[PDB]
A paper describes a structure:
The enzyme CdaA, which synthesizes an essential second messenger cyclic di-AMP (c-di-AMP) in many pathogenic bacteria, has emerged as a promising candidate for the development of novel antibiotics. The synthesis of c-di-AMP is mediated by enzymes possessing a diadenylate-cyclase (DAC) domain.
To identify crystals suitable for fragment screening, CdaA enzymes from Streptococcus pneumoniae, Bacillus subtilis and Enterococcus faecium were purified and crystallized. Crystals of B. subtilis CdaA, which diffracted to the highest resolution of 1.1 Å, were used to perform the screening of 96 fragments, yielding data sets with resolutions spanning from 1.08 to 1.87 Å. Additionally, we report the first crystal structures of apo CdaA from E. faecium (EfCdaA) and S. pneumoniae (SpCdaA), as well as atomic resolution structures of BsCdaA. Evaluation of the tested CdaA crystals from three different bacteria revealed that the BsCdaA crystals were the most suitable for fragment screening. Consequently, we selected B. subtilis CdaA for the fragment-screening campaign due to the excellent diffraction properties, high reproducibility and quality of BsCdaA crystals. Notably, these crystals tolerated up to 20% DMSO in the reservoir solution, which facilitates soaking experiments.
Numbering used by the authors:
A (entry chain B): 102 to 254
B (entry chain A): 103 to 254
Write the structure that this text describes.
């Protein structure tokens, strides 16, 4: 693999380790991966970080009742660009009625960008992904990893 | 000047984080690299190279989280790394009630010209280690003066 390929795989491993940890602990999380549609307008609503990715930093961001936990983390290639970012809320009727604002925000950004958003439910620990206006719920660890690898292909 | 405004913004971010941690008696260890390079200690932690903000500093030091166990090292107006090793001082002149966090701050200050801020988990007291000495029980004004003197 090229350095770009190695760096992408390290980023995927960091994201999946963080998501898995948060899912087991029922730590709510909202993580958007910017793709080809630029998300600068949303990144600028958050607290700038421009930080190297690590699973440790991703987990620390989402700990309940902390300064960075309320809103979305937006990742740009191999960096955490900003935390506590605003995303627009979807009104789609295909969002399960029991789901709250994190999932609606995720679907909402997926309606106006080609980004991939991961959501961890604070109620159930279930992991979902929003892409292209659709929410895909109850993902296994293997399904999430494959989704990310296919996204970064 | 722009450089002066950036240094002030960083001081404000550090002091806001320190105040929050002191109030909640969150232990913390924050080393500001100066002329002596600290790359060998930076390398022991989790790389960040992040923008400074009070929010990020507070999120790092939350007890029982991946990043809280060690020092944050700042360099060139950024957070270089978290959870870094610092060497323990063997000085017999540190207050005997103080533990490893304070001994680590004094230890790095023995071998570098860095400034290290410590918040005690026992009391929320704020101290600064520099040149092998620990300056204890600082007021907010006292810490700001130290940061401004350091950066002058």
């Amino acid at each position: 693999p090229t350095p770009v390929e190695e760096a992408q795989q390290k980023t995927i491993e960091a994201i999946t380790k963080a998501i898995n940890y948060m899912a087991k602990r029922r730590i709510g999380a909202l993580l958007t991966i910017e793709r080809d549609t630029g998300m600068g307008d949303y990144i600028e609503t958050g607290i700038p970080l421009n930080a190297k990715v690590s699973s440790e930093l991703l987990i620390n961001i989402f700990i309940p009742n902390t300064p960075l936990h309320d809103g979305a983390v937006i990742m740009k290639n191999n960096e955490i660009a900003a935390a506590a970012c605003y995303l627009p809320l979807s009104e789609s009727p295909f969002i399960s009625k029991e789901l709250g604002t994190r999932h609606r925000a995720a679907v909402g950004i997926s309606e106006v960008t080609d980004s991939l958003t991961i959501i961890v439910s604070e109620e159930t620990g279930g992991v979902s992904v929003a892409k292209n206006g659709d929410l895909h719920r109850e993902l296994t660890e293997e399904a999430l990893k494959e989704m990310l690898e296919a996204e970064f292909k």
